[PDB]
Write a protein that binds this ligand. Structure first.
Ligand SMILES: Nc1ncnc2c1ncn2[C@@H]1O[C@H](COP(=O)(O)OP(=O)(O)OC[C@H]2O[C@@H](O)[C@H](O)[C@@H]2O)[C@@H](O)[C@H]1O
Ligand SMILES: [Mg+2]
Ligand SMILES: [Mg+2]
Ligand SMILES: [Mg+2]
Lengths: 284, 68, 48
């Protein structure tokens, strides 16, 4: 019917302007030269690190990548870090400078950039879901499948909508990270004695949806974000109704939204919405 | 509305309540009896803590009474 | 309601590409994101 139309080989290409870089442009490349399985001899990426990352904060790795053990859990300042990827080939390290190489494909930029850690930035995402119900009480159904509502925050960096989540703290697990990110970003706690108990009853049942490489614009060749998605489903909806949403920390506005196939979100969060509607058997 | 709600109800796990409550332990709630025995005429048993309840713990200061 | 259960993304996308003709993927994506951004609060839209 269509002809010679390829549904596959749609590799992710970042934009050449890096976000908040002050007009610094990366190397523009085609979609066929994106992965490192292709050769691309004319690919000359630039090397850029952010000046907020160059002032050495507490959440960032130091600027020398030597003696850093990847693909295993490491102890930095007496704190546990994951430092491993979800790739089957694993993370590769360039021996000329000590910096790692991204296994998911070249992004046209080197160094760390805005990302604080060398290699795998481990992120945890909180997708809190409830059923989209009527004022009469019936669950809304589109295309023969049930319809989910999810909490979405609005980011202060790009002024557009995303799911709650964030980078991992040093010495903390993902259940502390996703709960602290949902408390600070989505709920706005910090920056109740019954609603906190209903929030703990909501947070007591959490299933791992996926663990996937992010399609972020901030990923360079030596720093890339891989995330794990934790879903918190309220089938009754009594725990989700007692949560008062207020935007805080790295979020401006937080509200309930309906999941659909034409969502315009930050990075690769639509793949996480497709995974949670595959897991909970909902509409996508 | 009852038939529609009945057809609506017919249709790697992790716990993350540490980050909301704090250092709250849901476990180790061992049963401790009251120190007054029932219908004993005011006879009191040895009061002990919940951590000294099981015999897997040591409790060297546990001196129970003997009553029939 | 029962009649609106067959409503989809793709028929709405074909409706937006019928009435506006944006001649781009990104302009059709931005007009579809604007038309889904208007209807996000259910109290604010009253359809007569
Ligand atoms: N590894 C890191 N890399 C970059 N910035 C960091 C890091 N760790 C801490 N920071 C600092 O902390 C803040 C990060 O906030 P988080 O809530 O941890 O992350 P956020 O950027 O809000 O969300 C990132 C989310 O987007 C997705 O790509 C990914 O799934 C992740 O969950 C930033 O202001 C930044 O300065
Ligand atoms: Mg944070
Ligand atoms: Mg955040
Ligand atoms: Mg944050």
């Amino acid at each position: 019917v269509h002809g010679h139309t390829a549904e596959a080989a749609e590799w992710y290409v970042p934009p050449e302007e890096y976000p908040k870089s002050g007009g610094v442009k990366r190397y523009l490349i085609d979609a066929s030269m994106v992965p490192l399985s292709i050769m691309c001899p004319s690919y000359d990426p630039v090397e850029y690190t952010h000046p907020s990352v160059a002032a050495q904060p507490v959440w960032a790795d130091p600027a020398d990548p030597r003696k850093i053990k990847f693909n295993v859990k490491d102890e930095v300042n007496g704190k546990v870090v994951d430092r491993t990827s979800c790739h089957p080939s694993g993370i590769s390290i360039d021996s000329n400078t000590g910096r790692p190489i991204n296994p998911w494909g070249r992004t046209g930029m080197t160094g760390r950039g805005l990302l604080g850690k060398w290699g795998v930035n481990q992120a945890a995402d909180t997708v809190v879901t409830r059923w989209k119900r009527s004022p009469d009480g019936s669950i809304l159904e589109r295309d023969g499948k049930k319809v989910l509502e999810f909490v979405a925050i609005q980011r202060q960096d790009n002024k557009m909508w995303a799911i709650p989540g964030g980078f991992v703290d040093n010495g903390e697990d993902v259940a502390l990270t996703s709960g602290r990110e949902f408390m600070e970003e989505a709920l706005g706690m910090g920056t109740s004695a019954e609603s906190k108990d209903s929030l703990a009853a909501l947070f007591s049942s959490g299933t791992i949806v996926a663990r996937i490489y992010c399609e972020d614009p901030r990923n360079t060749d030596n720093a890339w974000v891989e995330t794990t998605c934790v879903n918190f489903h309220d089938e009754s909806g009594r725990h989700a109704a007692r949560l008062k949403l207020q935007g805080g920390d790295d979020a401006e506005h937080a509200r309930w939204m309906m999941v659909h196939g034409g969502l315009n979100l930050f990075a690769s969060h639509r793949t996480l919405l497709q995974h949670v509607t595959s897991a909970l058997n909902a509409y996508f | 509305i009852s038939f529609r709600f009945s057809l609506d109800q017919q249709a790697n796990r992790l716990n993350s309540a540490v980050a909301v409550h704090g250092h709250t332990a849901e476990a180790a709630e061992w049963y401790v009896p009251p120190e007054e025995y029932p219908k004993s005429g005011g006879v009191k048993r040895y009061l002990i803590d919940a951590s000294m309840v099981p015999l897997s713990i040591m409790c060297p200061s546990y001196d129970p009474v003997e009553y029939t | 309601l029962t009649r609106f259960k067959s409503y989809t993304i793709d028929d709405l996308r074909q409706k937006v590409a019928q009435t506006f003709n944006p001649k781009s993927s990104q302009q059709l994506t931005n007009l579809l994101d604007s038309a889904l951004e208007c209807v996000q609060d259910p109290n604010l839209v009253v359809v007569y």
